């Protein structure tokens with residue numbers, strides 16, 4: 001019973017931390033940012 | 049206006065489709081540029 | 097919800113994305129949709 005309660009509490013804490021705008025997913029956002037920056041630079045290079 | 053045609057505005061030549069625009073050009077403005085310095089808007093020489 | 101995309105490579109029949117598209121740069125969609133991964 002104690003182990004079950006501890007596991008449930010840990011899962012609840014994980015949910016609360018994730019939902020409170022923790023900005024934890026930096027690694028997944030970096031890919032999108034870099035790809036978009038590369039494409040925008042490629043397009044903007046046409047003014048030279 | 050609404051057909052894919054070649055156009056020549058005061059020696060500025062191009063190919064594309066012409067449509068009526070809502071942009072607010074000032075009296076001393078005649079051209080509109082894009083991120084890649086591509087002409088996007090034009091003032092008609094006669095009908096303004 | 098936490099992470100937002102820029103272009104998912106879906107239908108773009110009709111900003112920066114239009115400027116990219118008019119200059120010959122396009123994005124292709126993944127084979128496995130999110131439902132299959134779920």
Ligand SMILES: *[C@@H]1O[C@H](CO)[C@@H](O)[C@H](O)[C@H]1NC(C)=O
Nearest residue numbers: 058075091092093094095096
């Ligand atoms: C001639 O040029 C004037 C310039 O303002 C323009 O208003 C007019 O429509 C043009 N055509 C004729 C037939 O006057």
